[PDB]
Each structure stands twice: as structure tokens, then as C-alpha cells.
Motif scaffolding. Structure first.
Motif, PDB file in Angstrom:
ATOM      1  N   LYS A  62      30.069  54.086  52.940  1.00  0.00           N
ATOM      2  CA  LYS A  62      30.165  52.949  52.179  1.00  0.00           C
ATOM      3  C   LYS A  62      31.766  52.310  52.012  1.00  0.00           C
ATOM      4  O   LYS A  62      32.411  52.985  51.638  1.00  0.00           O
ATOM      5  N   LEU A  63      31.614  51.035  52.058  1.00  0.00           N
ATOM      6  CA  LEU A  63      32.822  50.289  52.363  1.00  0.00           C
ATOM      7  C   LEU A  63      32.768  49.108  51.187  1.00  0.00           C
ATOM      8  O   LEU A  63      31.706  48.413  51.259  1.00  0.00           O
ATOM      9  N   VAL A  64      33.940  48.951  50.745  1.00  0.00           N
ATOM     10  CA  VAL A  64      33.854  47.760  49.578  1.00  0.00           C
ATOM     11  C   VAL A  64      35.115  47.366  49.640  1.00  0.00           C
ATOM     12  O   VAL A  64      36.385  47.944  49.641  1.00  0.00           O
ATOM     13  N   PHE A  65      35.105  45.823  49.764  1.00  0.00           N
ATOM     14  CA  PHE A  65      36.440  45.142  49.686  1.00  0.00           C
ATOM     15  C   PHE A  65      36.416  43.973  48.683  1.00  0.00           C
ATOM     16  O   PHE A  65      35.253  43.106  49.015  1.00  0.00           O
ATOM     17  N   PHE A  66      37.337  43.934  47.887  1.00  0.00           N
ATOM     18  CA  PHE A  66      37.223  42.979  46.842  1.00  0.00           C
ATOM     19  C   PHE A  66      38.365  42.047  47.034  1.00  0.00           C
ATOM     20  O   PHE A  66      39.681  42.698  47.554  1.00  0.00           O
ATOM     21  N   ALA A  67      38.574  40.687  46.906  1.00  0.00           N
ATOM     22  CA  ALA A  67      39.472  39.790  46.904  1.00  0.00           C
ATOM     23  C   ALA A  67      40.509  39.527  45.897  1.00  0.00           C
ATOM     24  O   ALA A  67      41.691  40.223  46.190  1.00  0.00           O
ATOM     25  N   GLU A  68      40.019  38.936  44.678  1.00  0.00           N
ATOM     26  CA  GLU A  68      41.083  38.654  44.025  1.00  0.00           C
ATOM     27  C   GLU A  68      40.348  38.475  42.433  1.00  0.00           C
ATOM     28  O   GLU A  68      39.186  37.921  42.580  1.00  0.00           O
ATOM     29  N   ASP A  69      40.835  38.986  41.338  1.00  0.00           N
ATOM     30  CA  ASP A  69      40.008  38.681  40.200  1.00  0.00           C
ATOM     31  C   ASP A  69      38.522  38.907  39.920  1.00  0.00           C
ATOM     32  O   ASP A  69      37.735  38.549  39.278  1.00  0.00           O
ATOM     33  N   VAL A  70      38.126  39.922  40.947  1.00  0.00           N
ATOM     34  CA  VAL A  70      36.745  40.129  41.277  1.00  0.00           C
ATOM     35  C   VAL A  70      36.278  41.079  39.827  1.00  0.00           C
ATOM     36  O   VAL A  70      37.010  41.995  39.350  1.00  0.00           O
ATOM     37  N   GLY A  71      35.697  40.485  38.789  1.00  0.00           N
ATOM     38  CA  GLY A  71      35.249  41.143  37.731  1.00  0.00           C
ATOM     39  C   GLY A  71      36.563  41.078  36.593  1.00  0.00           C
ATOM     40  O   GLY A  71      36.732  41.823  35.797  1.00  0.00           O
ATOM     41  N   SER A  72      37.319  39.971  36.678  1.00  0.00           N
ATOM     42  CA  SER A  72      38.282  39.905  35.933  1.00  0.00           C
ATOM     43  C   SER A  72      38.379  39.083  34.659  1.00  0.00           C
ATOM     44  O   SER A  72      37.110  38.386  34.621  1.00  0.00           O
ATOM     45  N   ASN A  73      38.784  39.266  33.553  1.00  0.00           N
ATOM     46  CA  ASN A  73      38.880  38.602  32.308  1.00  0.00           C
ATOM     47  C   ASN A  73      40.286  37.870  32.048  1.00  0.00           C
ATOM     48  O   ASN A  73      40.446  37.710  30.672  1.00  0.00           O
ATOM     49  N   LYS A  74      40.861  37.487  32.999  1.00  0.00           N
ATOM     50  CA  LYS A  74      42.107  36.921  32.697  1.00  0.00           C
ATOM     51  C   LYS A  74      42.260  35.401  32.125  1.00  0.00           C
ATOM     52  O   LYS A  74      41.648  34.682  32.572  1.00  0.00           O
TER      53      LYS A  74
END
Lengths: 13, 35, 35, 35, 13, 13, 31, 31, 31, 17, 17, 17
Positions: free
Chosen positions: G5-17
Motif C-alpha cells: 500500500k503506497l500513498v503519496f500526497f502533494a499539498e493541502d490534501v484534505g486541508s482546511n486552511k
């Protein structure tokens, strides 16, 4: 003139 | 001229209005879950 | 001129209005969970 | 001119309004959990 | 004029 | 004028 | 039995900023 | 039985930076 | 059996920096 | 610049701007 | 610059700006 | 610069600016 604003609530139980 | 706003409200609620009694809430506002 | 705002409210709630009695809440505002 | 704000409220609540009695709350505002 | 604003609540139990 | 603002609550139990 | 299982997230994934979030699960708000 | 789990997050993933969050789980607010 | 778990977070992952958080779990607030 | 009102999320209340 | 009002989340209350 | 009001989260209360 006069600006009267009232309101009641009567509750029996 | 002159503005004028009047507002009267009379509210009467019975036993359980808007109640989450016995509920199962799962809530998610944003965030990440990797299960 | 002159502004004027009047506001009267009379509220009466019965036994358990808006209560999470016995509920199971799971809430998540942001954050990360790696399970 | 002249501003004027009046505000009257009369509130009456019964036994347990808005109570988490017996509830199971799990809440998470930000943070990281690695399980 | 006069601007009277009142409100009552009578409760028997 | 006069700006009277009152409110009561009578409760029997 | 293999697994991966590989997971790569870039930026603000799921963010509330920058968000304004008013939330309510039960309870009472008057005015 | 093998197993694997890779996770790469870069920035602000799941973040609330700069947010205004008003939250309420039960309770009473008057005015 | 084998097992493995890698986790790489870079910056601000899951942070609240700069946020205004008003939170309430039960209780009473008058005015 | 602004001399009016800018509001994000408003529940009741009075704003006179 | 502003001489009005800027509010994020408001629950009741009075703002006169 | 500002001579108004800037508020983040407000629950009741009076602001006169």
C-alpha cells in the motif's frame, strides 16, 4: 406617540 | 429619514426537538484517514 | 436620522431539546489518522 | 442622529437540554494519530 | 412619547 | 419621554 | 500472501486552511 | 505473509492553519 | 510473518498554526 | 479599504456599519 | 485600511462600527 | 491601519468602534 411592544406566555401544568 | 427594525418571536418546544438521542454520528470536515 | 433596533424573544424548551443523550459521536475537523 | 439597540430575552429550559449524558464523544481538531 | 417594552412568563406546575 | 423595559417570570411548583 | 500500500500526497490534501467553519452536533444556540 | 505500508505527506496535509473554527458538541450558548 | 510501516510527514501536517478555535463539549455559556 | 461591513458567518446579532 | 467592521464568525452581539 | 473593528470569533458582547 408610544411604541409599546409586549408579549406574554401563560402555562398551566 | 431614520431606520427602524422591530423583531418579536415567541418559541415553545416540546420534549425532544432536534435531539440526537441514541444516534450514531460520524462526521468529517476535511482531514485524512488512511485505514 | 437615527437608527433603532428592538428585539424581543421569549423561549421555552421542554425536557431534552437538542441533546446527544446516549449518542456515539465521532468528529474530525482536519487532522490525520493512519490506522 | 443617534444609534439605539434594545434587546430583551427570557429563556426557560427544562430538565436536560443540550446534554451529552451517557454519550461517547471522540473529537479531533487537527493533530496526528499513528496507530 | 414612551417606548415601553415588557414581557412576562407565568408558569404553574 | 420614558423608556421603561421590564420583564417578569413567576413560577409555582 | 503478499501485500502492499503506497500513498503519496502533494499539498493541502484534505486541508482546511483559511476556512471559516461553524459546526454543531446537538446543543442549543440562542441569538 | 508479508506486509507493507508506505505513506508520504508533503505539506499542510490535513491542516487547519489560518482557519476560524467554532465547534459545539452539546451544551448551551445564550447570546 | 513480516510487517512494515513507513511514515514521512514533511511540514505542518495536521497543524493548527494561526487558527482561532472556539470549542465546546457540554457546559453553558451565557452572553 | 472599506467603511461598510464584511462578515463570514453570522448567526443573529446586530451590525451597524 | 478600514473604518468599518470585519468579522469572521459572529453569534449574537452588537457591533457598531 | 484601521479605526474600525476586526474580530475573529465573537459570542455576544458589544463592540463600538
Amino acid at each position: 406617540g408610544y411604541e409599546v411592544h409586549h408579549q406574554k406566555l401563560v402555562f398551566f401544568a | 429619514s431614520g431606520y427602524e427594525v422591530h423583531h418579536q418571536k415567541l418559541v415553545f418546544f416540546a420534549e425532544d426537538v432536534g435531539s440526537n438521542k441514541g444516534a450514531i454520528i460520524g462526521l468529517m470536515v476535511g482531514g485524512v484517514v488512511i485505514a
